Amino acid sequence: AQLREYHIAAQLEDWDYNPQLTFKKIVYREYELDFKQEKPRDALSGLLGPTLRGEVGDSLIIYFKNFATQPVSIHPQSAVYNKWSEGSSYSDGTSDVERLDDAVPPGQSFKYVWNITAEIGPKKADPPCLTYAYYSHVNMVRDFNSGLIGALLICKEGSLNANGSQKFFNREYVLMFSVFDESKNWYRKPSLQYTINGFANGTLPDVQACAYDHISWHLIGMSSSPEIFSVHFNGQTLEQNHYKVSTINLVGGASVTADMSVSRTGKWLISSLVAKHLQAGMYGYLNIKDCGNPDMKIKNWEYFIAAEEITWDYAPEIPSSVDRRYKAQYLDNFSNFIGKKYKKAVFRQYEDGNFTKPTYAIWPKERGILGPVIKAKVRDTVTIVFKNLASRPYSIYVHGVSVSKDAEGAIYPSDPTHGKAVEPGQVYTYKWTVLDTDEPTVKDSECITKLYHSAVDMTRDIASGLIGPLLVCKHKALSGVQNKADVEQHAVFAVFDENKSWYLEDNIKKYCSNPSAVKKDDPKFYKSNVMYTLNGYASDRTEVLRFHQSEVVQWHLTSVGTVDEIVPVHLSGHTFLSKGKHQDILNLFPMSGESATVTMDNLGTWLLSSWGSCEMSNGMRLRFLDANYDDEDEGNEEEEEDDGDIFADIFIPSEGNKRRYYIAAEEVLWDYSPKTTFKKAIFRSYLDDTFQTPSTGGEYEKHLGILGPIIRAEVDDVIEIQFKNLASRPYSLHAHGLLYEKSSEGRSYDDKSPELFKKDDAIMPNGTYTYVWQVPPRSGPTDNTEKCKSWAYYSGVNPEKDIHSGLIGPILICQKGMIDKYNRTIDIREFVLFFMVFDEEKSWYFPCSLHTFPAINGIPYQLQGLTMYKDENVHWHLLNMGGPKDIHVVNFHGQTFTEEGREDNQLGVLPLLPGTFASIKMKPSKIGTWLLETEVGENQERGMQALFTVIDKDCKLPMGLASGIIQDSQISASGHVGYWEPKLARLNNTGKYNAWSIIKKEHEHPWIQIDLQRQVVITGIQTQGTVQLLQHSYTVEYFVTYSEDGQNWITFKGQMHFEGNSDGTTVKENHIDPPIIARYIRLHPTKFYNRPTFRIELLGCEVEGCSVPLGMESGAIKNKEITASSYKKTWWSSWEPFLARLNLEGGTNAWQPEVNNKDQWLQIDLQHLTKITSIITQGATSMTTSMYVKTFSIHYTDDNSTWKPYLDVRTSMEKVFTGNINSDGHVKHFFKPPILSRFIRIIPKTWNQYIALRIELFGCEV
Amino acid sequence: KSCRVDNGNCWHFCKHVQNDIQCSCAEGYLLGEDGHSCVAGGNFSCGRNIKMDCKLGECPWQAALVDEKEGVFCGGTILSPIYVLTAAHCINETETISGEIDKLSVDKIYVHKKFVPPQKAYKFDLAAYDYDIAIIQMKTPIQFVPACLPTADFANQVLMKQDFGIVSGFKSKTLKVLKVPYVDRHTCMVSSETPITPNMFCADSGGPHTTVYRDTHFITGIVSSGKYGNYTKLSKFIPWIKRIMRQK
Ligand SMILES: *[C@@H]1O[C@H](CO)[C@@H](O[C@@H]2O[C@H](CO)[C@@H](O[C@@H]3O[C@H](CO[C@H]4O[C@H](CO[C@H]5O[C@H](CO)[C@@H](O)[C@H](O)[C@@H]5O)[C@@H](O)[C@H](O[C@H]5O[C@H](CO)[C@@H](O)[C@H](O)[C@@H]5O)[C@@H]4O)[C@@H](O)[C@H](O[C@H]4O[C@H](CO)[C@@H](O)[C@H](O)[C@@H]4O[C@H]4O[C@H](CO)[C@@H](O)[C@H](O)[C@@H]4O)[C@@H]3O)[C@H](O)[C@H]2NC(C)=O)[C@H](O)[C@H]1NC(C)=O
Ligand SMILES: *[C@H]1O[C@H](CO)[C@@H](O[C@@H]2O[C@H](CO)[C@@H](O)[C@H](O)[C@H]2NC(C)=O)[C@H](O)[C@H]1NC(C)=O
């Protein structure tokens, strides 16, 4: 343990993205103690504030002083804080003491006290220290872009030295890849900078690291609008959480923790291998330098490859399928456009150094323009002999291999040549070995995917057609064939942009109509050249990639080219098996490959494609067959026909349960602000196949939002969805993950199935269908650890434009057995969240981007039903579906979650990628209202951000009907027969008339409203009638009806009706799983014996659940702290202000002032700041009259030692509460927004007799 | 696609018509008057067992290859009164070869023309025990019970899609039995250093590996070698067996 204390502060500074015009920014910076001399602060941190640390059990204080022009703040992505340290401002109904952190104006300061819990620590499978970001929550989009940003490190217990530096690693470096838009920086400037830690144009100070060291990387990508990176360290491989790599996938607002292991001396380059990033100059160096420190199956391979300037045609055998406007925009050579084929400079393999006879007869079949497929195990020594044959110089560069600078094969901007860039006719030989540090882990597949290209002008080199898959594998793939798998496949999603080739004019001055006017860069023209590919094929073809049935084909995907977005990808019936998980889709960060293993569990032809641009749709797709062998020809042949060979050598010498739903695509009007009101097509469940009787809403479904009904099942179960359209245009049901036949697919493509299997492709209005979907082991939970698997279901006709129109739904497959009496999961809390930036400009309903509503579940901001207890298992199924642009780094505030299946992986922030949906487990640690979110600036503030809530586990404590603490003036009924009153409807209440009871009629139903006079949490009711003797007259059944705004209220349904009493005394208790929260509640009885006899009591807790006796009555509060304005002491008896305790009888019971006036007060010192929520007031009895305060006020202490009256949020001046009406009576008063002071005074305004009272404060320790 | 949908609610072999769904039956069975029921056609119908050590009469089909010197070397499975199925590596490894659980002349024996023995698996770097399948033909008709032969489809999408299978693998003095769960193909391929071909599958060699259905018995595989146990995916060699049966 320990107490870490940093002195931080905001302040402007003249930052220059080039140190070799500057901009004034507001950034963090660690001033020394007392703010005396600032501090050293490394030259590498740049704009990035000072990096914070702190093991587990420690405690961090942050003395923040705002020397800025604006109100800043400090804010951690890790739940190591409370609402007085949250540093964020929303509707949390807390005390001005808990909003002091929310914002800090210029000159103002604040003490940020964080408690780095063990619940939020790295733990099992995570490294020593996890990476996190902090930053001004006030206007994040405006506050960050300014510079306010830093890095927090939630280290683990016992991983640090005094130095504060990590002990496991020889080195430690914080890298923040950030995009800054000064055009948003308060001091607005029209400029856009791509920087690492603030250093643009590759001026980031040289990093340093001896040779043979063990680095601990803590990367942090971030921006305002959706931004994705793919960091890379030349001739170096990392381990992104137990996974060997080389290209790190970081999104805007995410952090990365990896451990590298250098092995080759020399300065290496550090960049995000993205198109834009790389041209913006964003880069750095890993200046490794030796330092003396110390660092069969093997079959040194050997390849002969060469650069050949060929003529490549993306369009060979272009089949009908393709889109017309496509083969007219990109293919067809009409309009002076180059056409389909351009001049390329690809790779080719030979069998000998003579480079005469190639190792093939046709350019490989299926690997398009892809170069030779390299390969190697661990500890093997590959030997490549490169021979340039093209016009200009080229090179060979490999990934995921600790190549040496002598065999690097890359050109840096700081050079005049050592086999780095071979020339025409020239021959060079790269000789690198697969180190053990490059070896893939136990998690990785048999083979890790990787690439290789020329490092002369990498970007421009590749666009000219220099790419090739490279696989690194353990000691399995033996020969040199694969092992474990019956098919090694490759699907490189390359985007070649001619206008970035070296033959850009060799093509224009050849394939053009009149090159003369050829205007390179002329939009229409440019976009033409810049075409999309899959393995070099710029469109689907006539041939289909055919695989067998029940066989396991291992894929190797890798998005190369100049891709700027995240290239997603899709299958069908079949699913990828990535990182030990199943996924019907795979997002590909540019330049970092992934190796899945999609087994053929389903037969029939299917489509594979990336769905995004009207360009990505066709430029990157293909079909694949999946069938047996069948028949046979032979058996039938013999039977009716002509038998063949036997194929044998002779010899003998020797002396699940069903499940059906009734969905329907209805039409609705939707406005995202209950002109914000649009028409949309939605779903909705019906009671049965009759329809017209849509199933009604429940409490839980009060959050689903737009999402259709929850299609839930268990493994091996079969689903029978009786979908039926009901809209203007035809729609369809497509289901992810599940095993659906060609009759239950819901998509029209070159499928070879007949019209019999096409009828599901789309259903025009009124159309009616049935989708029999099947849940096989590979569609549910993988391993016991996991509980429920998540899947989506949307339109097939036109997914994107259909999914935007309001058509989408959730699918849940839980462990065989995990579903109770009525279709709901037991022992856990369940939420489904849809993170998507709807765009009514894409929806069909609206006049191959102004009306956007970055909202969750189609409800930006609002929503509801997010009430969960504290400590109770709550899961969160997250579903995203936007294009390549909507990444949604989801975040739970003050909470920390693990992702199901991986209970050993902490995180706390989870980038939700397009076409992704993973389940996480919650179990929150803090109570109250909290914001859930996207750390993505643009959306965060423009809708996408719903608030959730938590309630103290112990929230069923009697709430004041037995004790009355709830006035009889609060209980009312629709009417009562007899002397029976609503006022007398209390539990265990005795007397000739002890309850409330009316007389039922053929008229309306009777009710009894209970006003708590303020919103609270209820989780249980209790019932009974009174026994005269012969008959009891009690209620048999009933239901509830809460409402916070007096008159308008809803009905509870988790459910509709509750169990009544069995007699006229027995206490029947009921529970409410989805806790209710409202100012008012009602009980409408339906069944009864004799008459609706009712006396009751509520069971819940306060919204904040803080109300606890502070010690007045208990005595915990010493009478030394109990001050007073004056205590009357007569010669006989006096009342000292420390005699003011609740329920106190004995002697001179209470406290009354010598001088009775509106100037009196009772001050109760608590010494240390405590949270106050509710205070009861009593009276006193003695000789002449019994006294009590008729009314009163309340004063408290302020942030800076100054008295302040408890002003009202529902008025101008401090509320004046209504005191007691007697002597030995209670009257609990609550505080709209809790009080967080150390000094409470109570100024009596009206009183009976002589001001006397007994107090009992209520609050928590905060 | 009904057949694919719970097996066209069929008891045995569900097939396809253009808009139909043809229901068949195993050998020696009478199809359901319903068009799916399917029942035992005779008293010597295959599959019918009795409804550790496999009670005598429980494994009425199981077979035993007897060698003069080594005695019982391999096991087999009675397919018909004339031909019994065995493993390829079970033949020509012993000096000779010839309704009993307490520890018949062989006429002809068909060894699959593609079987790859260990030695030969070495000579051409090929899959060992690949096509480990063979069929023995008795000199005299055996007096009856045999196991039922399934169809590639039925075996692929219905039989091999079970929880566990029966492997009456016998060195005890009495017959043995056990249930082995069907393991994934990738699980299998990544669980052994030995590369398993698309002919095999994993979950005594020569014994029968049957998958049960509607109180019936269908031959699904046959003991191979060997971590899980390897079997010869009889799904791929259904037509090859019918070839030899349809002998005449
Ligand atoms: C050294 O110094 C630094 C780094 O060290 C380098 O300077 C920077 O260099 C990089 C890379 O070359 C540049 O990045 C590019 O910036 C441009 C500029 O766009 C800005 O303004 C846009 C608005 O412009 C108006 O006019 C245009 C055209 O008429 C309209 O389209 C607009 O609507 C406007 O009216 C604005 O849209 C841009 O984005 C803003 O808004 C978006 C919302 O979507 C936000 O995300 C952003 O945060 C931002 O607020 C931006 O503000 C961009 O246009 C470039 O992006 C596109 O082009 C890229 C190629 O460079 C490529 O990745 C994509 O095509 C990308 O997509 C965009 O453009 C496409 C058109 O083809 C559209 O289809 C698409 O929708 C999208 O709009 C790119 O990001 C920096 O600008 C530049 N900064 C400088 C110079 O100050 C320098 O290069 C280094 N030099 C050396 C020698 O090392
Ligand atoms: C679909 O067909 C049209 C709208 O596309 C509608 O046809 C109606 O059919 C119902 C019942 O047969 C009638 O009550 C209506 O009079 C018909 N037309 C209209 C305009 O109401 C109907 O919306 C759909 N069909 C059905 C059967 O509901």
Ligand SMILES: *[C@@H]1O[C@H](CO[C@H]2O[C@@H](C)[C@@H](O)[C@@H](O)[C@@H]2O)[C@@H](O)[C@H](O)[C@H]1NC(C)=O
């Ligand atoms: C270049 O190839 C030379 C060709 O001789 C032949 O090599 C034989 C082994 C066989 O592959 C034939 O097809 C070839 O035509 C070979 O002798 C050399 O080893 C190679 N290297 C040189 C000449 O430096």
Ligand SMILES: *[C@@H]1O[C@H](CO)[C@@H](O)[C@H](O)[C@H]1NC(C)=O
């Ligand atoms: C009053 O009735 C209820 C029964 O649940 C409970 O408070 C208690 O049993 C009774 N009073 C007692 C026990 O003092």
Ligand SMILES: [Ca+2]
């Ligand atoms: Ca706060």
Ligand SMILES: [Ca+2]
């Ligand atoms: Ca279809």
Ligand SMILES: [Cu+2]
């Ligand atoms: Cu936030």
